From a paper:
RT-[name] and RT-[name]′ were solved as a crystallographic trimer and a tetramer, respectively. Unsurprisingly, no electron density was present for the disordered loop in RT-[name]′. Aligning the two [name] paralog structures shows a reasonably high degree of overall similarity (2.7 Å Cα RMSD), with a notable major shift in the position of the loop connecting the β3 strand (immediately following the phosphoacceptor aspartate) and subsequent α10 helix (α3 in standard REC nomenclature). Adding other [name] structures into the alignment (left), it is evident that RT-[name]′ adopts an unusual conformation not routinely seen in other REC domains. This large-scale shift in RT-[name]′ is likely related to the unique position of a conserved Q residue (Q193), which “leans in” and diminishes the solvent accessibility of the phosphoacceptor D (D191) (right). Two residues in the α9 helix of RT-[name]′ also adopt distinct positions: a well-conserved R at the N terminus (R173) and another R at the C terminus (R184) “reach out” toward the typical position of the β3 loop and α10 helix, respectively. Notably, RT-[name]′ was phosphorylated only at the longer timepoint and without a marked illumination dependence, suggesting that it is a nonspecific partner. On the other hand, addition of BeF3- to RT-NepR′-equilibrated RT-[name]′ did not cause any substantial spectral shifts, showing that RT-[name]′ binds RT-NepR′ to the exclusion of BeF3- rather than cooperatively. However, the analogous interactions seem to be inverted in RT-[name]′, which exclusively binds RT-NepR′ when provided with both RT-NepR′ and BeF3-, suggesting a negatively cooperative function for this homolog. In contrast, the absence of a conformation representing the final inhibitory RT-[name]′∼P/RT-NepR′ complex strongly suggests a phosphorylation-independent function for this homolog, the details of which remain unclear.
The GSR is a gene expression program that enables bacteria to cope with a range of adverse conditions such as oxidative stress, heat shock, and UV exposure. This response works using a so-called “partner-switching” mechanism, whereby HK activity—and subsequent phosphorylation of a downstream [name] regulator —controls the activity of a transcriptional inhibitor known as NepR. Stress activates an HWE/HisKA2 HK, phosphorylating the [name] and promoting sequestration of NepR away from σEcfG, allowing transcription of stress-responsive genes to occur. Exploring downstream effects of RT-HK, we identified two homologs of [name] in the genome, RT-[name] and RT-[name]′. In the structures of both RT-[name] and RT-[name]′, we observed a typical arrangement between the SL and REC domains.
Author numbering: 3 to 71, 89 to 259
Write the structure that this text describes.
C-alpha cells in the first residue's frame, strides 16, 4: 500500500528499540517481527491515525504493556530511548505510548534522574581514532563509570580484558556501508559474549537485519552525548 510498505521499512528501527529494552538480539528481533505480523494480519482500521513509524512503535508498546520478556521506574527507560535513539519529541513519544505529552516528559525526566543515581561500573573502549576515544571516555567518566582502557585494535582488546575484565565494551571498528567488516563484528560479539557490547556505527541499519548475530546496543555516529549516555546506561543494566 506504500503505507503498509512504509511500516515494514521501519522494522529495523523497531528491532533496535526492542533489542535495547530486552538486552538481547534474539528476544528483540522476535518481538519486533511479531509486532509487524500482527499489524499485517489486522484488516485496516486504526490507520491514518498515526505516521507509519509511530504506528509500528505504538503497536509494540501495546504489547509491551501486557508482558515484558522495581528498581527503575516503569515507562521511563522506554521514553528515554525513544527520545535518544529515535529523536522523537514529547508529543510523538506521547502518541506512541498513548499518554499526554507532558506525561511523556515526566518519563524522560525521571529516567534522567535515576541515571544520576546509577551504580558505578567498568567500561573498555575499542577505538582507533584517538580524539574519539578520549571524548567517549570523558563522557563515561562524568557518568560515574570507570574506563578500564582504550584498546586501539580488537587484537589489543583480548589483552586489556584479561588484565581488568570490564562489565561493558564500547566498540568502533570504523565500519562502512560495504559488508566487508561483517566478520569483524561477529568476532567481537563472540569474544565478549557474556558482556553487553555497544557498537558505534554510522550505518546502524546494516546491523539491524535479523539475519546474522548482531549487537543489542548501538551508538549512532556522529554521536550525541545524550545517546551515548543512554546506550551505556541501558547496557550497564544487563551487566553483572
Amino acid at each position: 500500500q506504500t503505507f503498509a510498505d512504509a511500516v515494514a521499512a521501519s522494522l529495523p528501527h523497531l528491532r533496535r528499540y526492542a533489542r535495547a529494552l530486552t538486552g538481547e538480539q534474539r528476544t528483540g528481533d522476535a518481538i519486533a517481527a511479531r509486532t509487524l505480523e500482527g499489524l499485517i494480519a489486522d484488516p485496516s482500521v486504526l490507520e491514518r491515525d498515526l505516521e507509519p513509524r509511530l504506528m509500528l512503535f505504538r503497536a509494540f508498546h501495546r504489547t509491551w504493556r501486557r508482558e515484558g520478556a522495581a528498581r527503575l521506574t516503569p515507562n521511563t527507560r522506554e521514553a528515554l530511548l525513544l527520545h535518544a535513539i529515535e529523536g522523537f519529541t514529547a508529543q510523538e513519544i506521547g502518541a506512541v505510548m498513548e499518554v499526554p505529552p507532558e506525561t511523556a516528559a515526566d518519563f524522560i525526566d525521571t529516567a534522567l534522574r535515576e541515571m544520576a543515581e546509577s551504580v558505578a561500573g567498568r567500561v573498555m573502549i575499542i577505538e582507533d581514532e584517538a580524539i574519539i576515544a578520549m571524548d567517549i571516555a570523558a563522557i563515561v567518566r562524568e557518568m560515574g563509570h570507570r574506563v578500564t582502557g582504550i584498546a586501539r585494535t580488537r587484537f589489543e582488546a583480548v589483552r586489556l580484558a584479561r588484565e581488568e575484565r570490564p562489565d561493558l565494551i564500547l566498540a568502533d571498528i570504523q565500519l562502512a556501508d560495504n559488508s566487508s567488516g561483517i566478520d569483524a563484528v561477529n568476532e567481537i560479539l563472540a569474544e565478549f559474549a557474556d558482556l553487553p557490547v555497544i557498537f558505534i556505527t554510522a550505518f546502524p541499519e546494516r546491523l539491524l537485519t535479523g539475519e546474522r548475530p548482531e549487537p543489542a546496543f548501538l551508538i549512532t555516529k556522529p554521536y550525541r552525548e545524550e545517546q551515548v549516555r543512554s546506550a551505556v546506561s541501558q547496557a550497564m543494566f544487563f551487566a553483572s
